[PDB]
Amino acid sequence: INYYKDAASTSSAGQSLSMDPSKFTEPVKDLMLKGAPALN
Amino acid sequence: INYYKDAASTSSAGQSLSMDPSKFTEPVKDLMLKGAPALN
Amino acid sequence: GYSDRVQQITLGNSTITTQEAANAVVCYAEWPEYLPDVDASDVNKTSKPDTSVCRFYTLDSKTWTTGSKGWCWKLPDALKDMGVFGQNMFFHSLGRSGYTVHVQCNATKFHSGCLLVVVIPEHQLASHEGGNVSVKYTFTHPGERGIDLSSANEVGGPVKDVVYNMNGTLLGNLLIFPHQFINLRTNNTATIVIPYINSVPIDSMTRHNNVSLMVIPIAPLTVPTGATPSLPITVTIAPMCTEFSGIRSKSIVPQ
Amino acid sequence: TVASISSGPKHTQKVPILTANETGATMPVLPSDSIETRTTYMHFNGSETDVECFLGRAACVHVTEIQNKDATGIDNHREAKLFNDWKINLSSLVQLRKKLELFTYVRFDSEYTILATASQPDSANYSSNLVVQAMYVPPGAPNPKEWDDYTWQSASNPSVFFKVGDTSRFSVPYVGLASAYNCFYDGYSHDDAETQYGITVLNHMGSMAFRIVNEHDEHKTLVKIRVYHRAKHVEAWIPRAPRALPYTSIGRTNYPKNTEPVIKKRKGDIKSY
Amino acid sequence: GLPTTTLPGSGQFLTTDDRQSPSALPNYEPTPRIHIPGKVHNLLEIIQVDTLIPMNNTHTKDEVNSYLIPLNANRQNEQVFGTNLFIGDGVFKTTLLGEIVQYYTHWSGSLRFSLMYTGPALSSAKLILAYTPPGARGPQDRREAMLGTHVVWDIGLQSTIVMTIPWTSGVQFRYTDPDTYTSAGFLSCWYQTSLILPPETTGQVYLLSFISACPDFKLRLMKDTQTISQTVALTE
Amino acid sequence: GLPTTTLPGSGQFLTTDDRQSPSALPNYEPTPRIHIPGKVHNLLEIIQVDTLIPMNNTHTKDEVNSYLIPLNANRQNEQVFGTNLFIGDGVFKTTLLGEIVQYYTHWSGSLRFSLMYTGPALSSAKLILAYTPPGARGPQDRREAMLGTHVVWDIGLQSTIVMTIPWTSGVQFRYTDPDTYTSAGFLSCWYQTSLILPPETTGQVYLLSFISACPDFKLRLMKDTQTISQTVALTE
Amino acid sequence: GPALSSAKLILAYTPPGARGPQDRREAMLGTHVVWDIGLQSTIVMTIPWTSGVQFRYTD
Numbered sequence A, B: 001i002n003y004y005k006d007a008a009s010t011s012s013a014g015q016s017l018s019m020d021p022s023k024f025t026e027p028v029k030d031l032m033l034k035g036a037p038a039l040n
Numbered sequence C: 001g002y003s004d005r006v007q008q009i010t011l012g013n014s015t016i017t018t019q020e021a022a023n024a025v026v027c028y029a030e031w032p033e034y035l036p037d038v039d040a041s042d043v044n045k046t047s048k049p050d051t052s053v054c055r056f057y058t059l060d061s062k063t064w065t066t067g068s069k070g071w072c073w074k075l076p077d078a079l080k081d082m083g084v085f086g087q088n089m090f091f092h093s094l095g096r097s098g099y100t101v102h103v104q105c106n107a108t109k110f111h112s113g114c115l116l117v118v119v120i121p122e123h124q125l126a127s128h129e130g131g132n133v134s135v136k137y138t139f140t141h142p143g144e145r146g147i148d149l150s151s152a153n154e155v156g157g158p159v160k161d162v163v164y165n166m167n168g169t170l171l172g173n174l175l176i177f178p179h180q181f182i183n184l185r186t187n188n189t190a191t192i193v194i195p196y197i198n199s200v201p202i203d204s205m206t207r208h209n210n211v212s213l214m215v216i217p218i219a220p221l222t223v224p225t226g227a228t229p230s231l232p233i234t235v236t237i238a239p240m241c242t243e244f245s246g247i248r249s250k251s252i253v254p255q
Numbered sequence D: 001t002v003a004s005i006s007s008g009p010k011h012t013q014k015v016p017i018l019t020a021n022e023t024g025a026t027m028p029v030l031p032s033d034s035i036e037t038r039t040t041y042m043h044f045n046g047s048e049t050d051v052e053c054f055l056g057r058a059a060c061v062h063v064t065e066i067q068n069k070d071a072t073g074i075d076n077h078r079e080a081k082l083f084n085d086w087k088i089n090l091s092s093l094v095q096l097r098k099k100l101e102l103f104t105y106v107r108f109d110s111e112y113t114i115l116a117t118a119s120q121p122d123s124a125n126y127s128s129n130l131v132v133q134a135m136y137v138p139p140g141a142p143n144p145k146e147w148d149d150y151t152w153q154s155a156s157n158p159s160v161f162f163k164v165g166d167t168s169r170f171s172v173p174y175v176g177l178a179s180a181y182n183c184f185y186d187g188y189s190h191d192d193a194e195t196q197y198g199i200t201v202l203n204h205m206g207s208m209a210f211r212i213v214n215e216h217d218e219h220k221t222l223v224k225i226r227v228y229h230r231a232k233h234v235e236a237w238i239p240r241a242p243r244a245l246p247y248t249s250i251g252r253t254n255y256p257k258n259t260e261p262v263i264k265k266r267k268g269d270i271k272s273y
Numbered sequence E, F: 001g002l003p004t005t006t007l008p009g010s011g012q013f014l015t016t017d018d019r020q021s022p023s024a025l026p027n028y029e030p031t032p033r034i035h036i037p038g039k040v041h042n043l044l045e046i047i048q049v050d051t052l053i054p055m056n057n058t059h060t061k062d063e064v065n066s067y068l069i070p071l072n073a074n075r076q077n078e079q080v081f082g083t084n085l086f087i088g089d090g091v092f093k094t095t096l097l098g099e100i101v102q103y104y105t106h107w108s109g110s111l112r113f114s115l116m117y118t119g120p121a122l123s124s125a126k127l128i129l130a131y132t133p134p135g136a137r138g139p140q141d142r143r144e145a146m147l148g149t150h151v152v153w154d155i156g157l158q159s160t161i162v163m164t165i166p167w168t169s170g171v172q173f174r175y176t177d178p179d180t181y182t183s184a185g186f187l188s189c190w191y192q193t194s195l196i197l198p199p200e201t202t203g204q205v206y207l208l209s210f211i212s213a214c215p216d217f218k219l220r221l222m223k224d225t226q227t228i229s230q231t232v233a234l235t236e
Numbered sequence G: 001g002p003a004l005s006s007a008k009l010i011l012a013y014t015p016p017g018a019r020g021p022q023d024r025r026e027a028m029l030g031t032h033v034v035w036d037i038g039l040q041s042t043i044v045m046t047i048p049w050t051s052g053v054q055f056r057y058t059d
């Protein structure tokens, strides 16, 4: 129950439960498959 | 939920969301169209 | 017979071929794109010179020697004088751009050495004076020359200490930024595609640089016996999806 | 969810453990690519590492102090701490600072808690009960010159009145100019040759001003204000390397000269355990 | 008895909170409303009405004359007036727009700047108005001025010209109190050809100038105005 | 009036509680969000990116050189480096992994340790990396080392080798600050055959080493880092 | 050159209207190809037809 009118006044947000490290761990242009050779 | 009986005791009103500047910006008797000459 | 290894990038009226690549990085897995209306604020129609600004400019070459500490360029600064890209830059109030960066360094199968090529969004430098000394404008706008981390402290300039990234963080952790290594034994180029990254939809190109490109020797250069002890490093960079807006009189900037 | 699958002997032409780090990727290698594993489940979600959780607890961001005393003959209230201010900023204290600077841009609503306690360091008959008044002077607003000015009227300025010893709490929407707060800014206000450098030029959101409503009693009373800040509704972009050297200034990245080696030297060889 | 816990902030008085209260006058009946022309709902409604700018600020005590921008016959190439666009300060500051902007911390949007000509009907003139977006200096000559937002105004039967300063900005809000990073540009005006008076006529002619906000406009984060203060409470 | 009772804890301020509060700025409209590449949601997303380990810690002031593990041509049977696995201390401590682990009290999971070789292309080498699970001493010779988790690495075209320290543990969580009961083992590396340089070449070659966490990893019970402190508040 | 050597050259075409370039900076602003000497021994640069008039004289 929100007792207040504005959105800033609500409690903390709830877990992204998004999670996708590939923008950080695999930003390569041509896709690399694990097990296939790195450099062909 | 109002806890009180009288109307003065309720919280602030809620946004007019009315908004019509023409009584102030265009109080002319004969309607002016933008693009048409001001004085004919 | 496609290898990760050979590549061709054609952009505008200029083409680059590498026969010894190590894939390419696209920052944060996003490719440069123009500014959508839903994200727009300034009401001005923007100018998109296209092929006259989105081509490859090769900056002047550096020389890696056994004593090198590393070099640093800022964008869009490094290009402030390249062809029509630069003119547009000084002439509009606002502009926006992504880039393809291609760093080149070839040697032979007897050399060793490994450079880190990294792009740091919003690289705010530190004053070597400490306290709250600022880093004057000119010092953070070296132009095509870039900053040479093995040059001496100057007054009003930034600190040039490598194991601290010019800001109080350790060299070792620069790997959290989009980056690629050039290991003479593997690699001969590094290519990074940079999407436009800012907290505003379009900004000024002269009062704010939005990425520093940094090339840092990490495993020292080691040449074969009686080889000349140095290799040149060349940086070629191409603006991509550039847009300029708010045209007028032509900025005058310090120094 | 499985944390590890079962995997047995391998004799392949398909080697997942050989890679080329020069590419910039961190290939997702697992225990089961190089030893024989058994199934195990995760039993865990990663709840407490969510950025909302990481930045979402109150941190002390500021300690100031004001006193209640006879202002008779004081030529400069501000200077007598008849009332103080704090040109708002979250770079003051470094505990919460390091956490925030793990990211480049950050966007969130703030919840402030303000604790005020009183001290009576010299002989008093009693402890008086004072009421504090915290008013946020938005930039371009009449700055309190005195302690009972016309400014304190704050007829358009959000202000809160609470008792010393007690706490005040509220929340503020994200009042950033841009789409997010710039944790770092490699630019200037304008193309000048002497203009400052950093964010200290970007983060100019006025200041908060405190004062004691009560007049003065016979003794003097020191009131010390602690402001706590909790981020709610957090959004963070572009991770960066953590801060290694100590901080010297609000808003610049500068570290102190002749600082000490931050990497612990081995007591022994590279070979040492 | 239901168990409760009180949180931090209990008992505080926040001048901006909005809650219910007991009525001191239970059951009282207010006077009926009758109709009155002119109801205002938003301050955004009124900042779109234009008001005069004391552009000619050069006097030494407030006078009707600082509303008049003078024009000289037969000058060529030269500059009529110049001003920066810090709407919360300087010429703008006493105008209704300036005066309201000052109740808020941030503004964004387009401005409408118009000039009404008052010279004899048998005279003629062509002026250029130029808006210079942030980043360059106030133009120093028309050549410089004409390369940015501009309108050649031809003085005719239609007495006023409405120039718009379109919102040109990186950051989507600017501060109303003058700030650098956040600065908006300059506005200048020059002779395009020149003012020409008919025979039997002489002297200076004046332009009146107005400012109002486009429907585009946004103002946010209310605060107190530097435009009013006091030293003791008033009495009757 | 509804009857209530207040419980123990009323009026306390717990920095970790999460409740509603009145907004000081009623009705204010925040700036629109625009798109920015790079959004982070979990610290678990970032500790999977590998970063360099200053393994060569033997210097006396921080230098680029403590990231370089040297290799000697023609040595046989010998040991390249050794370290315990207290990820919250020692070599690991300044790495991004080490640096984040320090914000939490407990960790569990697999680690990924990789080595990238930088020697001339015409050289060759075979190294063995060994993980020794808790309970035995740091191995003293390869024979001892090779009886635990190990990988023979053959230096080739493929420049890096990724060793995983699989989670070997009785207790399902270990403390990030070094603790005995909770200790994780040792990591050592030895020549399997030996480094061989081509003609016309000489000296030391170096390995770079990285550390990142497997997707396996769990961190819990947040706390304050020993990695940052201060003596007076900073100012502008 | 020997197979164990390496080199990177830039070839530049300068369309009519400017002088023969005097340094690479000047050269690199017109049609150009960075050539990386590798296994593939030849590089084919095209001088695309850049012209106002649709024919040029051979003399």
Ligand SMILES: Cc1cc(CCCOc2c(Cl)cc(C3=NCCO3)cc2Cl)on1
Binding pocket: D088, D089, D090, D110, D112, D134, D135, D136, D158, D159, D160, D172, D175, D181, D203, D205, D208, F024, F025
């Ligand atoms: C980063 C960052 C975040 C902030 C906060 C902005 C200022 O927020 C406040 C507002 Cl809008 C109001 C009040 C306030 N109103 C009544 C009492 O306090 C206090 C603060 Cl800190 O500044 N830098």
